[PDB]
Enzyme design. Structure first.
Site, mmCIF file in Angstrom:
data_model
loop_
_atom_site.group_PDB
_atom_site.id
_atom_site.type_symbol
_atom_site.label_atom_id
_atom_site.label_comp_id
_atom_site.label_asym_id
_atom_site.label_seq_id
_atom_site.Cartn_x
_atom_site.Cartn_y
_atom_site.Cartn_z
ATOM 1 N N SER A 47 0.795 -1.224 0.000
ATOM 2 C CA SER A 47 0.000 0.000 0.000
ATOM 3 C C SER A 47 0.831 1.279 0.000
ATOM 4 O O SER A 47 0.258 2.353 -0.212
ATOM 5 C CB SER A 47 -0.950 0.010 1.199
ATOM 6 O OG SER A 47 -1.924 -1.015 1.086
ATOM 7 N N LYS A 50 0.391 3.410 -3.101
ATOM 8 C CA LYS A 50 -0.722 4.329 -3.308
ATOM 9 C C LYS A 50 -0.225 5.768 -3.451
ATOM 10 O O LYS A 50 -0.947 6.629 -3.950
ATOM 11 C CB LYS A 50 -1.729 4.216 -2.159
ATOM 12 C CG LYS A 50 -2.556 2.933 -2.214
ATOM 13 C CD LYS A 50 -3.570 2.852 -1.086
ATOM 14 C CE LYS A 50 -4.414 1.581 -1.173
ATOM 15 N NZ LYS A 50 -3.622 0.337 -0.915
ATOM 16 N N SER A 95 -6.494 2.847 3.234
ATOM 17 C CA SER A 95 -5.731 1.974 2.348
ATOM 18 C C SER A 95 -6.668 1.058 1.558
ATOM 19 O O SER A 95 -6.593 -0.169 1.622
ATOM 20 C CB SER A 95 -4.706 1.172 3.154
ATOM 21 O OG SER A 95 -3.687 0.650 2.321
ATOM 22 N N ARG A 227 4.613 -0.807 13.356
ATOM 23 C CA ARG A 227 5.190 -0.007 12.281
ATOM 24 C C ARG A 227 5.368 1.440 12.721
ATOM 25 O O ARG A 227 6.455 2.012 12.592
ATOM 26 C CB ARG A 227 4.303 -0.084 11.039
ATOM 27 C CG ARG A 227 4.196 -1.471 10.429
ATOM 28 C CD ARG A 227 3.139 -1.510 9.337
ATOM 29 N NE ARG A 227 1.823 -1.145 9.850
ATOM 30 C CZ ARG A 227 0.715 -1.100 9.117
ATOM 31 N NH1 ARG A 227 0.751 -1.400 7.824
ATOM 32 N NH2 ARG A 227 -0.433 -0.753 9.680
HETATM 33 C C1 XEV Z 1 -6.595 -8.774 3.081
HETATM 34 O O1 XEV Z 1 -6.511 -7.374 3.341
HETATM 35 C C2 XEV Z 1 -6.094 -6.973 4.583
HETATM 36 C C3 XEV Z 1 -5.750 -7.878 5.572
HETATM 37 C C4 XEV Z 1 -5.372 -7.403 6.815
HETATM 38 C C5 XEV Z 1 -5.338 -6.043 7.066
HETATM 39 C C6 XEV Z 1 -5.677 -5.125 6.074
HETATM 40 C C7 XEV Z 1 -5.638 -3.664 6.339
HETATM 41 C C8 XEV Z 1 -6.671 -2.830 5.914
HETATM 42 C C9 XEV Z 1 -6.626 -1.469 6.157
HETATM 43 C C10 XEV Z 1 -5.551 -0.916 6.827
HETATM 44 C C11 XEV Z 1 -4.508 -1.723 7.260
HETATM 45 C C12 XEV Z 1 -3.322 -1.127 7.977
HETATM 46 O O2 XEV Z 1 -2.208 -1.186 7.407
HETATM 47 O O3 XEV Z 1 -3.520 -0.604 9.100
HETATM 48 C C13 XEV Z 1 -4.559 -3.094 7.017
HETATM 49 C C14 XEV Z 1 -6.056 -5.607 4.821
#
Ligand code: XEV
Length: 242
Positions: A47, A50, A95, A227
């Site tokens: 991500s 993006k 995201s 993170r």
């Molecule tokens: C399969 O997709 C998945 C699986 C697990 C987590 C996420 C996700 C969604 C939005 C934000 C975030 C983040 O980095 O905080 C993580 C997405």
């Protein structure tokens, strides 16, 4: 120049994980990291992609502005915040992969490839599906390579309009108080080993800017908060933020 500071390794081995933090002092033009080798190891951007994806969509007119609404396609996904309408600001914040997959499809392979080379972004390889290559395709980028890209964005030096870069930097806004501003983007790569989390961006101070780029092993989603927490601990140790 660069300097390796293995003292920061504690912040990773204290939460039973492994990773790298790369810092760049813009005023002094000096870099710092706990692990020079991992700092130059290239991973899937996930991500964090993006950022360039938004820049390209804006500069080609795929996205008109940060207010344009991208309607939910009506397919229920397991991330509740994805099952709703979004604009560029909220799609970045949560995201929202499906929004950016549509951007990429409208961008197309040729223009996407042309733009990532102009950005000197990572290995510049979009091999795979145009709407998922940043999750399970051939594109790779290292932490030090993220810094170089972010510094260009900060200074409006990427080969897109100033407007496109200003809008994306607005969309990157993560935290702001009387002491600092953070503009950053998280990443979570799971489809190819090793599974990692990303956090890349910079810290704006009154009289300086510190760019940062970190990644860490992420065997499960339980540790995603590390993170930002590990990065901030490094920033606090170096007294970059209180
Ligand atoms: C399969 O997709 C998945 C699986 C697990 C987590 C996420 C996700 C969604 C939005 C934000 C975030 C983040 O980095 O905080 C993580 C997405």
């Amino acid at each position: 120049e660069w300097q390796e500071n293995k003292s920061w390794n504690a912040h990773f081995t204290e939460h039973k994980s492994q990773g790298v933090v790369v810092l760049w002092n813009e005023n002094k033009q000096q870099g710092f990291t706990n692990n020079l080798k991992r700092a130059n190891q290239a991973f899937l951007p996930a991500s964090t992609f993006k950022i360039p994806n938004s820049l390209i969509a804006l500069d080609l007119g795929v996205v008109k502005d940060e207010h344009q609404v991208f309607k939910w396609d009506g397919q229920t996904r397991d991330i509740a915040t994805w099952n709703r309408d979004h604009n560029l600001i909220t799609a970045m914040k949560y995201s929202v992969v499906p929004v950016y997959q549509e951007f990429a499809r409208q961008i197309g392979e040729a223009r996407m490839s042309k733009m990532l080379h102009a950005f000197d972004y990572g290995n510049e390889d979009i091999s795979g599906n145009v709407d998922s290559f940043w999750l399970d395709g051939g594109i790779r980028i290292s932490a030090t390579e993220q810094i170089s890209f972010l510094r260009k964005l900060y200074h409006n030096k990427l080969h897109v309009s100033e407007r496109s870069q200003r809008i994306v930097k607005q969309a990157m806004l993560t935290e702001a108080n009387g002491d600092y501003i953070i503009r950053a983007k998280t990443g979570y790569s799971t489809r190819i080993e090793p599974k990692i989390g990303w956090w890349v961006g910079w810290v704006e101070l009154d009289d300086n800017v510190w760019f940062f780029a970190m990644n860490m092993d992420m065997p499960t989603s339980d540790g995603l908060g590390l993170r930002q927490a590990i990065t901030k601990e490094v920033l606090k140790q170096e007294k970059i933020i209180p």
